Each structure stands twice: as structure tokens, then as C-alpha cells.
RNA sequence: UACUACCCUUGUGUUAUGAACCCUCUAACCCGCACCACUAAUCGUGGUGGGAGACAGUGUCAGAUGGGCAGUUUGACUGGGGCGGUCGCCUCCUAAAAGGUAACGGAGGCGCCCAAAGGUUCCCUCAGAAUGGUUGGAAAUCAUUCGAAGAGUGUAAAGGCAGAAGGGAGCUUGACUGCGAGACCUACAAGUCGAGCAGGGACGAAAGUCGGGCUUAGUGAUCCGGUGGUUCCGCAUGGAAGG
RNA sequence: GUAGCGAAAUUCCUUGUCGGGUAAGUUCCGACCCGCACGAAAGGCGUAACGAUUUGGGCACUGUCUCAACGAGAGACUCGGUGAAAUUUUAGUACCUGUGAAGAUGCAGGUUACCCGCGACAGGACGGAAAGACCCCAUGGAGCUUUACUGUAGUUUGAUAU
RNA sequence: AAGCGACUGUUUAUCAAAAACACAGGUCUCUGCAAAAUCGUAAGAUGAAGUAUAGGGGCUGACGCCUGCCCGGUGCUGGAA
RNA sequence: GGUGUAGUGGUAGGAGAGCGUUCUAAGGGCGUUGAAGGUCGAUCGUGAGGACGGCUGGAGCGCUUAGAAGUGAGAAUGCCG
RNA sequence: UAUCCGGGAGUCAGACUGCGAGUGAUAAGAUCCGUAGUCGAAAGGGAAACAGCCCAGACCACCAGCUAAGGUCCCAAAAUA
RNA sequence: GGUAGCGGAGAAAUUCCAAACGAACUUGGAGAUAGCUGGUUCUCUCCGAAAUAGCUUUAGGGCUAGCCUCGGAAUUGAGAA
RNA sequence: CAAGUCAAAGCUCGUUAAUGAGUGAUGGCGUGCCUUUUGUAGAAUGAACCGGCGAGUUACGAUUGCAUGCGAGGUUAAGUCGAAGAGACGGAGCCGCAGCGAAAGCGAGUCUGAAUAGGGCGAAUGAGUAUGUAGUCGUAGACCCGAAACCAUGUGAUCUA
RNA sequence: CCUGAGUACGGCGGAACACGAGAAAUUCCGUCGGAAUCCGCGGGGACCAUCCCGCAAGGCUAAAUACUCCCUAGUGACCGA
């Protein structure tokens, strides 16, 4: 049997050209009155997956 | 009871005298202006000092008993 | 698995969807076509026979990264505007299948 | 105003229909009722009587009840465990003059408030003591002097502030939008600061300040739903559903 | 909370107080009732007979004991025959003091001790037997309870069909 | 002489013989006969080849004197606008 | 291949070099003038280990290169004898 | 020897000694931190014996020498200096 | 002869149901699962740790970072004293 | 005296003949092996002894390194022919060469944004692919043993109720 | 004129379809209700219109595919008590 792809990751990341992963941000759903606007505008900007985290999830989302 | 405390926040100097540094850097975190701003230095909402342009950090006495930070470029 | 700690996938949000009617085109970047003899007719059939394009996914799209140096009667599904400019400037002729 | 019709509300009737409900019927169903036959049979199947009767029973669907039965749950830290207490966040000490640093070590706070307690421009400087003066005292308020902060700073403590961040009066709403080089902290997720650019503004003559408050707490993922907008998609097409 | 009972199969305090029994009685019997925390079919109070029932006292009786002594027989013991088991890292397997995973046959220092056995005892080998049953832990199990959760067989009510 | 249980019986085969169980007796409750209850998918069966002086279930437990107050709560029964 | 300098304690652990066993393909060679195995030797190699002899034994086995693995035991209150 | 990239791990029970503090009874081979060392994972020499103290880091051989801490009357090498 | 395990029988003790019954025995799912203990076999060489932070229905487990090893790479040589 | 080691007298033999073999009085030093532990000589665990047996394997996939072939082209799968073969055929498909964005869509640019702004992700910097091999991971019992237990058939009342 | 009626379909309850009611097409079971038929009917993933494709509710149908108690001929870098 071949690998199973973690679909919860396949719905939550995206491959770049260098193989790295794009990701949405947290603290961006429902509770904004507690957050300044700098946080909100800086969190609507995506970011990239960490080194040690990609080390942990690459086997899951190997090809995707 | 008494058993609790907060995350220690990492105040104090972050750039050293005689040290070239980038613009927008941070030189001295603080609560209250234990050191004032000076040349080419600003101050944030939390009284944190930051160099507006490049240059060497220089700390100076602002007269008798208050301190200053300055950034003289090259 | 992070030991019961909330995993990275779960602490992040799902984003987007997939368009079932998506048109993904096979790309030819204008540095290839320096191969073919000037004046000829480039087609998906030609590109496949040469082996340049093996997967005509939705149609050939032509894009302009490299420098063109020939007259060519190229034809495809879609062209980019810079590719149109470069071809028509070299002296070729754009068509659309 | 008579009279003709078009007629309209209201409530009487005929007829046809639809439901609900009570009684009556027997012909379905039923009888661990009797008799006859199959038959030597307390079975059963039929037949004849009698009884009940469109109920019951059975099927489907639904509501209440249901430890009768079943599958499961029933935190951690901890000078054993348990109770007490604690779990998230902020401040100080411990913390050993960078930073960091533990204990069921010592002390306290937070889960908000403010439409001015913000911004800008202009102006001002406090606490207490002495002296005197009416009710008015130990002490309100008035006046002079002394007065370097011994006050105040929305709210804890620390740091800091009298070139004010403290106080007062005008004009406003920058408690803006898109962003953001670069740094700090950081396992990750996050958090913090941020010059500067652009748009469109506030105040001010102008310089220039303004992306909340004096600085640090006032908060919590994703999933899932809700609201508004959208130039996004829309299972052959147009829409729609739904994203 | 009545009758009735009450330091009780119930009374902690408590060896309660008083009396009897004993030279001496935390037990026992009878009264008192500050009933920690009796009580009326979870029955209360009483009750002849019954009991391999529990408790205390007395008489007789005795080796239970004071304090052991003797005898008999089976085994043990010697010989002949026959012939296991548990256990077992190797072993030429002393003592004191001390040390040391904190309690030493084995390390140290000192002392004592010719070699090999037989019968006896049982202080140690933290002896053997048994992966502690007390304790804690496991995001273990099983049985059981329930106004824990979620369900369900049945029970019941209704609608509909026959 | 005292306690418990009235008694004869039964009981943890292999650590508990008992003051525990049962017992006759008492009381409450249900059940009208295709009973009620129970086994079982249902047929079918026990109950009973019985019929409220019978049967099932709960509690107490010979005999004697007794068995007090509480229906607010939880259940049950009945009722009904 | 040599000279010099410096170094070479080691658990978990990482890396690299190997010895040995069984089998296979090829090459080559040794065995009734006595194979393997067994046993004793005072032998060689840095180690895993490798030869040569003596006795036993009686028919298959080494050596070189490469390959494939049921490839190496001292403990499992391990199993069988 | 630091950094960046990538492969593979193991480790999340630590102990003592000295110095700096807390808890403690300024007691504990106690507990919890910091700091340095050692052990762990380190043999050797001394401390009688003695992981954790003092000296010192085993690649091997030598019937060679100089020293460390600690020691020099005998056990037991060295001065009855 | 009858009652058979989601059970039966039980003068009722968690009691008996073929020498251990809070749910018999046997076969199969089945090599159940085990963050738990025990074990895991030849050699040499190079290098060589940690017992810490954070989070964890987490605390004797795990994940990331920290500490180790191996390969590559480049850089105004940053590293250590 | 964890039973040896080192030194060594004496005695007896004579080798894979070389700083020989065996024994050993006597003296010095020296608390087994494993596991698990901060730490075990351990009075913590396991082993009576001997011999045999007995534990990281394979299949399919992923990734990294090493090697080979080819190279911005590298490669076939199934199936057919054919020694249970190699090999040929088979280009369907797979990876890479172009990415960015939720997507429309644009394209060495794209997205955000009013924006030639700035910023993110990418390109100009470039190399991958097929096979083998080894390390590692995943799915399968996955390293070996070891539970109490759960479920579904069946067998049992010759014991006992 | 005919072209498969208690049928398709719908409601309720459940299943299978990769698809756990979800926006849930399609298929099937139970129950209840309940069509037209050539200008007709079903599908194209709620659904409506257009277009396209097909014509259920009646039946059969070899081959390629799976497996070996067995028989014959055999093969093995499978075992060798
Ligand atoms: K009394
Ligand atoms: K009492
Ligand atoms: K003894
Ligand atoms: K349970
Ligand atoms: K009542
Ligand atoms: K073996
Ligand atoms: K060391
Ligand atoms: K000796
Ligand atoms: K590879
Ligand atoms: K290559
Ligand atoms: K459906
Ligand atoms: Mg949102
Ligand atoms: Mg601020
Ligand atoms: Mg949690
Ligand atoms: Mg009857
Ligand atoms: Mg239950
Ligand atoms: Mg379960
Ligand atoms: Mg606990
Ligand atoms: Mg405690
Ligand atoms: Mg400090
Ligand atoms: Mg459409
Ligand atoms: Mg459609
Ligand atoms: Mg008394
Ligand atoms: Mg009463
Ligand atoms: Mg009572
Ligand atoms: Mg009563
Ligand atoms: Mg009684
Ligand atoms: Mg002891
Ligand atoms: Mg001792
Ligand atoms: Mg010694
Ligand atoms: Mg004898
Ligand atoms: Mg013992
Ligand atoms: Mg145990
Ligand atoms: Mg008494
Ligand atoms: Mg009796
Ligand atoms: Mg009797
Ligand atoms: Mg008994
Ligand atoms: Mg009774
Ligand atoms: Mg080394
Ligand atoms: Mg060395
Ligand atoms: Mg052989
Ligand atoms: Mg093996
Ligand atoms: Mg053995
Ligand atoms: Mg010191
Ligand atoms: Mg300690
Ligand atoms: Mg210390
Ligand atoms: Mg260790
Ligand atoms: Mg040492
Ligand atoms: Mg040791
Ligand atoms: Mg000398
Ligand atoms: Mg001497
Ligand atoms: Mg009991
Ligand atoms: Mg299974
Ligand atoms: Mg000894
Ligand atoms: Mg031992
Ligand atoms: Mg043993
Ligand atoms: Mg269960
Ligand atoms: Mg029988
Ligand atoms: Mg349909
Ligand atoms: Mg239906
Ligand atoms: Mg056999
Ligand atoms: Mg044999």
C-alpha cells in the first residue's frame, strides 16, 4: 500500500517553488475586539512553515 | 496564597556601545524611560528605543544623572 | 503527533476550494522554439512528436521568458501578450486553435 | 323614500362534499367456547352454532417511561496518595549589578475602563506646614510665605515623568486605510517595537505631532455555525442551491 | 421520637457512677440514664423449651500448670536392599569493629582457626516456595450501583394499513 | 445467670455452622381467568388440568403485650377542568 | 610509500572498515596415498579469527571474485533433550 | 572551531563536592535553583576500606627514569632527617 | 432423566454448574492490546552526549528546540581565550 | 581469601624448537557476569550445568546519501512473443522543464493593494529522471516473548445445586 | 392500437454507493400514499428551463478473472530429523 496523504494538511498548506510550505495564520477567526489592528493586518498575511515542523509533516504531505 | 508570577520580559540593553547596527533595530527595551532617546533614535509605545538609521551606538550621560542613546552614522 | 499538544494542522485554518472547471495549460516558454526551422508551423502535434510537450493538459500556452530569433507560424490555445509581441516582432504570425 | 335589478355584510335552509366524535350493524380479523368430520388426536385444518367485532392482534412511524439490560466516562501537580491550594495573564522579591533561572518560596493584582481619562495647540504646577481670618471644628473655602516633589499619574506593584506622561481650556476623532525595511523574544504557534512609503485627514501660523491611553495584564487556537460586502467559483449551458 | 428499652451485638468520652461477685474483676450480673450515634413489622419489649450458638461464675475432675519424671510403641539412629524432590552464578563458604546501594562468609584492619566427617539445634545466608494480595501508577481490566452520559428490550399512548 | 435467634432444619464442596438463610405465623400489594407473574423472537408452556379461603410479589418472622406522630418531599393509585 | 607534528578512556548513540557461517554462478584444485566433522598441540594475525601437523573418521570439501541471507547467543522465572 | 543546508540518533529519573540564595530548625547523604568541577560514561595513585573528595585522563610493550597529591619507625618504598 | 453460560440452580454464601466461576471449558477472530517489565547473538577503529526549556487528561510516555554524529556548502573568518 | 593475576624456589617432561610445557611452596594486588540504576560486590533481578533452538525480516510506497545510464528530456506500467528467463514491442501514463493566487485568471511574473508603491512567493543563480544499493519513516503482527480481558460459535448436570 | 402499474416516484424510517443528512443526486429494503405513456418517459450530483444522451419497471448469455482436495510431468541460490 502507498502512503496516505494527510488531508487536513492538504487543506491547510500549499507548496512553493523551493518546496517550502505556505500556511494561513492563527488568531484570525472570531474574537477580534481583543486584538489590535496591527495584529489583524499582519495576520491576514500568510507565512511559511517552520523548519522543525516541515521535518515532522513532510512524510505526510510528501507529494500531495 | 502566593504561588504565581508572570513571564519575565527580556528588558535591558540589546545593542552595545561602539556597535554598528541596522536601522529599525532595537537598542534598549524598558518600562519607563530609564534611558532617554537621543540622536537618530526614537521611542515606542512601550518606551523601547530604536535606531532610525544605521550607525554606531553611543550611550552618554544627559548631564548629571540621566542617560541618553545616540546613533552617529558613518 | 506532538504528545497531545494541539498539532500544527489542527491549529491552522482551511483555505479555499477547488474549481472543478479549472483549465490548466501546458507551458512553452519561447526559448524552446529556437529549435524549429524558421517559417515552419508549430502545433501541439509538432511539440508532442518532438517530445517537448508530453501532456497537453488543457491546451498549449506560450510564454515569453527567453529570446526568440526566428519567424514562426505558431498556433496554440492561448498566448501571452509579451509572447505575441516577441513573435510578431521577429516576424512570425499568431493563430489560435 | 315607490318600484327594477347589480348586489354586499349578517344568519336560516336544501343538496353535494370533507374531517372529528358517540352509538348500531354484520361480512373482514379473533375465541386456551361447544358440537361434527378428517380421527384411534385436549394438536391442527375445515363445517355448523354462539360470543366479541371493525376493537383487539400484527406491521410501520412517532411521544412518555425505562439501570430490566448494554457500551462507556469519572483531570493533573503534589516532599506517597487524599483534602486544602493551584492550573491562563500582569508586577516585585527570590534572581547571586546583562538576560534567563526552580520550589506546595514570600507579597499583591487582572478577566476591565475612557467618547474624554484619546490626538493636537495654548496655558498652568503639586503635597503638606506656619500665620491670619466668621459661622467653621483638629481639618472645608480665602490670602501670603515656606515650599524639589515628600503630590498626581483611571485601575495592582515596579520603573519613569515637574523641559512634564501631572492639571485646565479651545478645535477636533490618527481609538485612520493598505503596508512595512529592520530588530527583540521565540521550540512551534504566537507576542513586541518599528522608522519610512502611499492615500485621505485632524490640530496648529508654521515647524511638526497624531496608526489610542504612562509603560507593562484586561484574554483563548482550530472545527463549527451566524451577520454584511464581494469584480471569486457555480458538475453539459443559463441560473439557483451551495461554497 | 410515643409506649417500651437503655454504657446495650448500639455508649466515643469510658476501665462512666453505685452495688454484687473476686484477696485483687477494662470482662459478667443488677440499677442510674449527658441515649457521641435505641425505638416500634430494616419491627419494639418480654419469653418456657431448643442451640457442636456467644459470654461469665461455681462444684467435681484432672500433668493445663507449679516443675517436670518414667515406661511402651512407630520414626529418627547402625547395617543390608531400593531410591526421589524442592533448591543450586562459581566456591578452598570464621569472628569483631568499620566501610559500602546506608544491616558483609566474600572489601579493609585486627583476631581466632590442623584436615575429613557423624548425630542434634535452627541465629544468618535480607534462606526456599510465590514477577507483594497492603500502597502508588496504568489516559489497564472485570463485576456492581445510580437523580453520571448515551442508547435499547419491554410497558404504555396516539396516527395509519389489514 | 446473661445476650442472640423462638423451635427441627439449611449454609460459604476445599480456612467462617453463626446471632446469617428458611420456617410456621402476620401484614401490605397485584391479579375475574386466554388471569397476574415468568421462560421464549413468536408459537407454545408453567401458573393449572388451579380460580380470590387460589395464585404471584415485597417486608417481618413462633407465642404474648404492642405496633405511636408525619402524605410537606420521592414513588404509586385515582381523578380530572 | 616515507618524514615531521598532534592525538587514539568511553555508556546511549552516529560513522566507517572488516572476520566468520550457509547457499549460488564462474574460475581454478583436493580427496580411500583418506574430505568434512571430532580431539590434542608449546602456531600466525591488531581483533573478529586463520592455518599446519598427530590420533579418530570414512565421502564429499576447499581457495579467488561477486552475489543472496532463516548469517554469529550467555542470560529471555526462555523451549526441548 | 563557528555558521547554513540535509541524514541519523539518543537524552526529558540525575547524584555528590565547593561557592551564592531560598524552603527547612540558616538540621539532614533532605528539597529546589545558579555557578564550576567530578561521577554518570573514567581506569590509575592517596584518603585503611570509600561512584561523587585530593592528584591525574589507560593506544600498546619495557625487571628504564623524573615528578604530582599524599608520604618517609615496622606492617608498607622512602629521613628514627 | 430435565434445566447450560447475555445462562441455569440456589432454605441465598458471590454459593455450585466435571479437582481455582463477580460470569465455566474449548475453538476461532488472534501473532488482541500493552505509553508496562524481561530479552535482543561477531570484531576493530573515528567521534561522543544528556538527565535541560516549552507544550502535553501531560508528569516513569511523547513532540519541537537544546546537547552528539555524518555528508555537502560558503563566507570581509565569523568561533574560543 | 569472586579462587585469578604478577613475581618465584623446587620437581617432572621435551614443542607448530621458541626469551619451552606442566605443576607450584611462598609473597604482592584484587568484592563474579547480565539487567536496571544517581549509584549494585551487592542482602535488588536472571541464570543448576551442557548441547541445540531462539529476536529489526519482507511486500508496497515516501525521503536522503552513494553509484551507474541519459540529460531540460529521463522513463515505461499492464499486456503480447519468448527457458517460470534475458530481450524486443508497448508512450497510455509518471517526474521535471513556470510559477503566483482561495479562485476567476495572469504568466517570469503573479497576489495583496487605489497604486508605476512596498512586501510575500517565485525567475534571472538554474538539473532532473530511471534503476540498484544502504540509512530512516509509513501501512501491514513489523523486533521477540508475556497479560488480565472482549466477542462469536460450539461442548458439558456421569461432579455438584 | 401497443411498447413490462400498485410499477416508477413522493413522505417516514434505515442501508449501499468513496459520499457519516449533509446542498445529497444515484441504487436497494420495510411501511403508507400514489402517475403519464410518443407532443410521452428517465438521467446529466439539490432543483427549474434549454440542449444532449438514453427508453426502466420481464429473462438468459461464453471469454478474459479468482482458487486447488486432487492426477500427471516437473522445478527450487526451499528444509535436511
Ligand atoms: K445506659
Ligand atoms: K448508639
Ligand atoms: K538457621
Ligand atoms: K468498569
Ligand atoms: K406524597
Ligand atoms: K546458536
Ligand atoms: K569528563
Ligand atoms: K596468590
Ligand atoms: K534512492
Ligand atoms: K545521476
Ligand atoms: K443520499
Ligand atoms: Mg472569518
Ligand atoms: Mg501603547
Ligand atoms: Mg488537552
Ligand atoms: Mg391459559
Ligand atoms: Mg451499567
Ligand atoms: Mg471498548
Ligand atoms: Mg495523580
Ligand atoms: Mg503529599
Ligand atoms: Mg539579572
Ligand atoms: Mg451549471
Ligand atoms: Mg447538472
Ligand atoms: Mg460496666
Ligand atoms: Mg410505624
Ligand atoms: Mg433500627
Ligand atoms: Mg419500620
Ligand atoms: Mg428481630
Ligand atoms: Mg537494610
Ligand atoms: Mg556493616
Ligand atoms: Mg580492595
Ligand atoms: Mg546418616
Ligand atoms: Mg524469599
Ligand atoms: Mg510485581
Ligand atoms: Mg453485654
Ligand atoms: Mg436457630
Ligand atoms: Mg440445629
Ligand atoms: Mg468450608
Ligand atoms: Mg428478618
Ligand atoms: Mg575515542
Ligand atoms: Mg588517552
Ligand atoms: Mg558443508
Ligand atoms: Mg538467527
Ligand atoms: Mg542454555
Ligand atoms: Mg573548593
Ligand atoms: Mg539528594
Ligand atoms: Mg550545587
Ligand atoms: Mg544511565
Ligand atoms: Mg577513579
Ligand atoms: Mg560502577
Ligand atoms: Mg626522585
Ligand atoms: Mg620501609
Ligand atoms: Mg458479600
Ligand atoms: Mg484483529
Ligand atoms: Mg578475597
Ligand atoms: Mg546475585
Ligand atoms: Mg534464581
Ligand atoms: Mg465489558
Ligand atoms: Mg446427564
Ligand atoms: Mg431518479
Ligand atoms: Mg419508500
Ligand atoms: Mg518433526
Ligand atoms: Mg543428527
Amino acid at each position: 500500500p502507498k502512503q496516505k496523504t494527510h488531508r487536513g494538511l492538504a487543506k491547510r498548506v500549499k507548496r512553493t517553488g523551493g518546496g517550502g510550505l505556505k500556511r494561513g495564520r492563527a488568531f484570525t477567526s472570531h474574537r477580534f475586539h481583543g486584538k489590535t489592528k496591527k495584529q489583524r493586518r499582519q495576520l491576514r498575511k500568510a507565512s511559511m512553515v517552520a523548519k522543525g515542523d516541515y521535518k515532522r509533516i513532510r512524510q505526510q504531505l510528501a507529494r500531495m | 496564597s502566593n504561588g504565581r508570577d508572570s513571564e519575565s520580559k527580556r528588558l535591558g540593553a540589546k545593542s552595545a556601545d561602539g556597535q554598528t547596527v541596522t536601522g529599525g533595530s532595537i537598542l534598549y527595551r524598558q518600562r519607563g524611560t530609564k534611558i532617554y532617546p537621543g540622536v537618530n533614535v526614537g521611542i515606542g509605545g512601550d518606551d523601547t528605543l530604536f535606531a532610525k538609521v544605521d550607525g554606531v551606538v553611543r550611550f552618554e550621560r544627559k548631564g548629571r544623572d540621566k542617560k541618553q542613546v545616540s546613533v552617529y552614522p558613518v | 503527533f506532538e504528545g497531545g499538544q494541539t498539532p500544527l494542522f489542527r491549529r491552522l485554518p482551511k483555505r479555499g476550494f477547488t474549481n472543478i472547471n479549472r483549465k490548466d495549460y501546458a507551458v512553452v516558454n519561447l526559448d524552446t522554439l529556437n529549435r524549429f526551422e524558421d517559417g515552419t508551423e508549430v502545433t501541439p502535434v509538432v511539440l508532442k512528436e518532438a517530445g517537448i510537450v508530453k501532456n497537453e493538459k488543457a491546451g498549449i500556452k506560450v510564454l515569453a521568458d527567453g529570446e526568440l530569433t526566428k519567424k514562426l507560424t505558431v498556433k496554440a490555445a492561448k498566448f501571452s501578450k509579451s509572447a505575441q509581441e516577441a513573435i510578431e516582432a521577429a516576424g512570425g504570425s499568431i493563430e489560435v486553435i
Side-chain angles (χ1 to χ4, degrees):
Chain A
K2 66 180 79 172
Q3 279 179 350
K4 306 301 289 291
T5 300
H6 195 283
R7 303 293 291 163
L9 279 167
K11 293 177 187 179
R12 298 181 190 191
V13 300
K14 186 182 285 293
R15 288 188 183 283
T16 62
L21 272 66
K22 187 181 181 181
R23 67 181 177 85
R25 299 293 297 278
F27 296 174
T28 187
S29 177
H30 69 88
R31 196 177 173 284
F32 294 102
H33 63 272
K35 294 185 282 290
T36 62
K37 190 67 184 289
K38 186 172 77 175
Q39 297 182 2
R40 293 178 282 173
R41 69 167 65 96
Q42 288 180 351
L43 290 170
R44 70 172 65 94
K45 299 292 184 181
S47 67
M48 297 295 288
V49 176
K51 182 180 175 178
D53 291 332
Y54 178 80
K55 185 180 178 183
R56 192 174 65 237
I57 63 176
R58 62 182 299 170
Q59 190 68 253
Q60 294 182 356
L61 56 87
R63 290 185 291 108
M64 187 172 72
Chain B
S1 67
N2 291 325
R4 62 191 184 276
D5 193 358
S6 65
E7 184 181 1
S8 179
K9 290 178 177 64
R10 279 72 179 273
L11 301 175
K14 301 292 182 179
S15 294
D17 190 0
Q19 186 178 4
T20 301
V21 73
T22 60
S25 67
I26 295 170
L27 306 174
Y28 191 79
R29 295 280 197 182
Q30 53 176 352
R31 299 289 183 268
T33 182
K34 190 181 286 185
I35 298 167
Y36 289 176
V39 176
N40 293 318
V41 173
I43 191 162
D46 57 355
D47 298 333
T48 60
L49 299 177
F50 65 98
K52 294 180 179 178
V53 299
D54 301 337
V56 299
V57 174
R58 299 291 182 189
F59 294 165
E60 301 178 356
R61 66 181 182 275
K62 185 176 175 66
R64 185 185 290 278
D65 57 356
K66 293 184 183 182
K67 290 184 180 292
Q68 186 181 2
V69 183
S70 64
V71 179
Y72 295 104
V74 176
Chain C
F1 188 70
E2 295 184 355
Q5 184 183 1
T6 304
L8 183 61
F9 69 91
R10 191 188 287 277
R11 68 172 68 99
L12 297 174
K14 296 187 285 180
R15 186 175 294 275
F17 67 100
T18 65
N19 187 6
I20 188 162
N21 287 326
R22 181 165 190 266
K23 276 74 72 181
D24 190 74
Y25 294 103
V27 172
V28 177
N29 199 2
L30 191 66
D31 195 0
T32 60
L33 298 174
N34 291 322
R35 289 177 182 273
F36 295 93
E37 292 179 354
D38 59 354
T40 191
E41 183 177 359
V42 177
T43 61
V45 178
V46 169
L47 295 171
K48 185 176 180 182
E49 287 175 352
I52 298 164
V53 176
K54 296 179 179 176
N55 190 0
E56 293 82 2
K57 294 180 182 179
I60 304 299
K61 188 185 281 192
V62 178
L63 305 177
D65 190 0
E67 295 292 327
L68 185 63
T69 63
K70 292 185 180 180
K71 181 177 177 178
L72 294 173
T73 59
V74 184
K75 64 181 74 174
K78 291 183 179 176
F79 290 169
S80 69
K81 296 183 181 181
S82 63
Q84 292 175 357
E85 291 175 354
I87 292 166
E88 183 176 0
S93 66
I94 62 95
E95 291 81 3
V96 177
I97 298 169

